[PDB]
Write a protein that binds this ligand. Structure first.
Ligand SMILES: Cc1cc2nc3c(=O)[nH]c(=O)nc-3n(C[C@H](O)[C@H](O)[C@H](O)COP(=O)(O)O)c2cc1C
Length: 368
């Protein structure tokens, strides 16, 4: 079974290829990592396994969900360390995903109820609704488009948060540049309507993610930096006229960064879309294989993977590691279960974003 052949990700000797995909669960009350996170990650950690934390705040204006952890204050760093220690004690490797939502926020999540920032002034449409602190859904407001100087301030927040992640003990960080968020808002031409040097051409649209990656690399080293993108996913009205072209454009910038920096990134992480048929290589698969073949380094595929699809991905060389989200929610021992090809617990979406430290978070049973 390919999923269980070792894999050397940089200095990390991974015993298997099943990865915990970053997942927002909203248990980090008031943005403070909670002991619950500790038990949650500990349950899923395995000797030689790779975990990626839920997206984490890089500043006071980077959140668009309630109770998501942050890593921009020393207090948060202190609490993250305890979680990182419990995970390391299991022999797992763990990276902290640095996340800024951009225009996908609401005044309720912004200091002084200010407007969320973005590359544009256009708001997400009403086809998408934001989750509110009280569990109901809200309207995405008009964001404020930032200038060159402010862009550099946000880049600095990523930088500072990356240093904090390292101070907390994390083995590295993952730059969240997918799913229609801040970075993705500069990447997708369906959103980026700028006329300055951060908009228009592929090179300009790629500038922001490049500056962000460069800043953290120069701060903690390319080896402790992973990057996540999703050119073919349009979540939150984040579409591009040419998904494949945009992805390759991003891949080229990353390869260039590695060559100039003289070191490879931890990995490239890509979320893929899944079409829907009926009672059930292809464009989508080929787009993924193409980004993988173009990228000089470790490739992590994600999005609707199963035990079967995962084995296939590693077996055909389409990916080095496979990240699982939803199945990892309901199966703390997903790695063991996949290895023994045992049944899988179904996940209850109702408690994906509730605040209880146990219910729908750590009370999913292990294999008996
Ligand atoms: C409840 C939930 C929360 C998620 N939170 C994040 C997140 O904070 N950052 C991110 O990059 N992806 C996030 N994802 C996407 C996952 O990392 C992963 O790409 C996706 O779950 C893969 O598909 P799967 O659920 O079929 O395995 C989330 C997914 C779910 C279901």
């Amino acid at each position: 079974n390919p999923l269980f052949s070792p894999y050397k990700m940089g200095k990390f000797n991974l015993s298997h290829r099943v990865v915990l995909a970053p997942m927002t669960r909203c248990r980090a009350l008031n943005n403070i990592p909670q002991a619950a996170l500790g038990e949650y990650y500990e349950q899923r950690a395995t000797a030689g396994g790779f975990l990626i934390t839920e997206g984490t705040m890089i500043s006071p204006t980077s959140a668009g969900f309630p109770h998501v952890p942050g890593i921009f204050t020393k207090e948060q760093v202190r609490e993250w360390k305890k979680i990182v220690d419990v995970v390391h004690a299991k022999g797992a490797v763990i990276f902290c995903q640095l996340w800024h939502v951009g225009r996908a926020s609401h005044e309720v999540y912004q200091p002084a109820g200010a407007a969320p920032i973005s590359s544009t002034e256009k708001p997400i449409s009403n086809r998408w609704r934001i989750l509110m602190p009280d569990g109901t859904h809200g309207i995405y407001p008009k964001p404020r488009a930032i200038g060159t100087y402010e862009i550099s301030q946000v880049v600095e927040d990523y930088r500072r948060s990356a240093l904090n992640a390292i101070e907390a003990g994390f083995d590295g960080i993952e730059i969240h540049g997918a799913h229609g968020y801040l970075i993705d808002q500069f990447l997708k031409d369906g959103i980026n309507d700028r006329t300055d040097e951060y908009g228009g051409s592929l090179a300009n649209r790629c500038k922001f993610i490049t500056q962000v990656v460069q800043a953290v690399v120069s701060a903690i080293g390319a080896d402790r930096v992973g990057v996540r993108v999703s050119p073919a996913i349009d979540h939150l009205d984040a579409m591009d006229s040419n998904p494949l072209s945009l992805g390759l454009a991003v891949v080229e910038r990353l390869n260039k960064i590695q060559l100039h920096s003289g070191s490879k990134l931890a990995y490239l992480h890509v979320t893929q879309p899944r079409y829907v048929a009926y009672g059930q290589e292809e464009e989508e698969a080929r787009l993924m294989r193409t980004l993988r073949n173009a990228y000089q380094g470790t490739f992590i595929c994600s999005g609707g993977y199963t035990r079967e699809l995962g084995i296939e991905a590693v077996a055909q060389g389409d990916a080095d590691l496979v990240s699982y989200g939803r199945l990892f929610i309901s199966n703390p021992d997903l790695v063991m279960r996949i290895k023994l090809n045992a049944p899988l617990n179904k996940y209850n979406r109702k408690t994906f974003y509730t605040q209880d430290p146990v219910v729908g978070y750590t009370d999913y049973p292990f294999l008996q």
